[PDB]
């Protein structure tokens with residue numbers, strides 16, 4: 138109704154027939170499919186997000202969840218499909234106070250082949266929701282980025298890291314989701330200064346960081362000392378403190394692709410996981426948000442670099458930020474790499490109670506706490522009882538929500554329809 | 558009852574383009590439902606071409622000049638690049654060796670309903686497809702574009718030239734110290750979108766040049782010469798946007814044109830194409846930075862390169878800004894018998910050639926007039942000869958009538 142008024146009349150006669158479909162009628166799903174056909178702009182065939190029967194709730198792994206200091210910020214790690222986690226994350230925030238996250242950072246699978254190899258699907262080709270190649274990859278992030286928006290604060294930021302293989306298409310896609318007026322920058326990251334051998338006989342040296350602000354977000358200025366030590370090539374040559382406006386280019390020794398990977402290898406004692414972001418890159422991004430107690434989210438958490446980064450910044454910043462992570466355990470990367478890295482960083486002993494990894498020999502343990510959650514799926518038929526309601530309340534209670542005045546609802550269980 | 562036939566068709570085929578749920582929504586919810594959706598941009602109807610008018614070039618003999626028959630011959634066209642491109646396609650079709658090795662353009666960024674008729678992106682769609690027609694198999698096209706509009710152009714050039722041929726999206730750090738626009742942030746970079754037709758491989762860069770011009774980027778021979786593969790980052794002292802603006806004002810002794818690109822940037826790009834004798838095209842020529850760069854690269858490289866420029870007289874720029882630049886650089890003296898501007902006190906004149914053409918419009922039914930049809934027919938032949946075409950073919954009336962129907966200007 139309102140969306141059609143905004144679109145106006147490029148093809149109005151067809152709209153009159155579309156308006157007839159509303160009268161005949163689970164409507165918004167059909168409207169989105171229609172609008173794509175008639176739309177005048179960037180277009181692709183969206184696939185309808187058909188809510189499966191099952192429902193998704195958080196179950197806390199009490200053995201894996203640890204807590205070293207009650208005074209340190211409380212942090213969260215959700216293990217499972219990020220589509221189900223985000224549905225649960227939104228329900229938690231609604232029933233909660235101080236709603237939504239101050240910062241969002243994600244490193245989604247760049248390539249269409251990379252997504253299939255070790256991630257979501259539905260095995261010879263990449264197919265998502267009956268769609269192949271780019272349409273799949275686009276459909277994927279559209280529905281996740283829609284939710285991510287719902288979770289972002291009015292004065293919040295969302296950072297996204299992309300390759301050249303989907304960057305332009307994601308910036309157009311994110312323009313639709315977050316609004317083209319809120320596009321802040323498309324910052325280049327020279328993470329491979331030496332240049333990687335590329336099929337087209339060129340030395341691809343760079344990467345992007347799409348920044349989209351909430352409607353009234355103003356980026357924070359960088360501290361002189363941080364900018365001189367960390368980004369010496371970009372900042373060189375008088376009220377309050379000495380600060381720098383963020384320059385839309387990221388390049389420096391700390392911000393190498395090899396740095397982030399070597400760190401992980403040193404903590405994990407394993408080079409199995411080969412794609413990690415520089416911890417310093419993410420510190421710089423979250424530094425752009427003025428609240429140094431910001432709530433950071435990263436539903437493509439991978440090796441937990443976001444978590445380690447927040448912790449490092451807190452040590453240097455002097456403020457207490459909490460992070461929420463989500464990552465599926467495809468080949469255990471979620472269970473093995475995220476937990477191991479975060480555990481070893483926090484306590485200095487391996488899960489096998491062995492302390493031989495190089496990192497702890499070099500630096501001291503952070504001594505923070507991490508809550509681990511799983512995704513348990515219950516049947517829609519059994520929904521359409523007492524066990525579901527019971528666990529939902531535990532989830533809310535798990536996140537420090539006063540549950541004396543909250544009850545299970547059909548509206549809320551409808552919100553948590555899982556993905557097939 | 559028509560439902561039964563529609564239901565049968567739905568049940569008959571499904572396949573990739575339809576999701577089982579999509580089929581369920583098509584039957585649960587007809588030409589609109591059966592319409593196919595392509596991944597990319599949908600555009601409003603563009604401005605119709607004038608069926609009752611044609612455009613032709615007409616050399617300005619007073620303005621065009623020649624200094625050295627051994628140096629390459631270059632071209633400057635004044636007017637709407639859409640009408641200019643339509644002629645250039647007719648010129649190449651009748652030319653012995655067809656089409657350009659290098660296209661560089663820096664279009665304007667620009668409420669504008671993109672995808673609309675006069676929308677910034679629609680007009681670029683129309684002109685880019687023609688430039689696609691004007692590019693050789695083993696050629697390149699460079700477009701400079703800003704932080705915000707870079708993505709829409711990239712997916713467009715994906716449609717027009719194909720994503721298979723996307724080479725790089727180079728960040729050019731052309732404002733080392735940022736400038737705040739649209740938001741509280743120091744915007745420091747631009748993008749260069751590199752596309753090439755099949756059979757094009759970028760040339761490696763000379764160590765000596767790479768070291769002086771880009772020392773920050775090419776930090777520390779099996780073959781014959783020292784070569785660096787092109788890194789997708791352009792940070793240099795000589796790649797400043799203020800640098801290109803000071804050069805232009807060094808020549809013109811005027812600050813009237815504020816958005817001049819550095820010539821070192823456009824040198825690095827055309828220096829990316831293999832052969833020294835290359836044809837460069839730039840149908841958004843602005844102040845002619847592309848022309849200055851081809852000549853300067855020729856002085857450094859030793860190869861003879863010809864450029865073709867096109868720019869309109871929006872604010873008289875193409876006459877005052879673009880021509881004066883090219884003129885004062887070739888001739889070593891202002892056009893009005895003066896010689897006191899800075900550039901020529903610091904560097905030698907190139908002493909090269911340049912031809913200036915205007916775009917003239919002649920209403921149809923002037924063919925009905927006997928004296929006008931001949932005038933148009935001779936002006937068409939004069940074009941070809943001005944661009945070094947033999948003209949033995951297409952002298953007849955049939956061939957001329959086929960190429961004149963191809964040159965129709967835009968609606969105004």
Ligand SMILES: Nc1ncnc2c1ncn2[C@@H]1O[C@H](C[C@@H](N)CC[C@H](N)C(=O)O)[C@@H](O)[C@H]1O
Nearest residue numbers: 218219244256257413414437439440442464465
């Ligand atoms: N549908 C999905 N649901 C949950 N996790 C996913 C999904 N798709 C990909 N992932 C994970 O998200 C992470 C994406 C990574 N590229 C992120 C890298 C991360 N920035 C790091 O420093 O390690 C990987 O661990 C993937 O296995």
Ligand SMILES: Nc1ncnc2c1ncn2[C@@H]1O[C@H](C[C@@H](N)CC[C@H](N)C(=O)O)[C@@H](O)[C@H]1O
Nearest residue numbers: 637638663817818841842843844846868869871
């Ligand atoms: N339809 C058009 N036809 C010809 N020129 C145009 C047209 N639209 C814009 N322009 C010109 O294209 C140029 C685009 C400039 N931004 C390019 C600047 C140029 N690259 C320089 O370094 O000086 C401007 O001079 C515009 O006046």
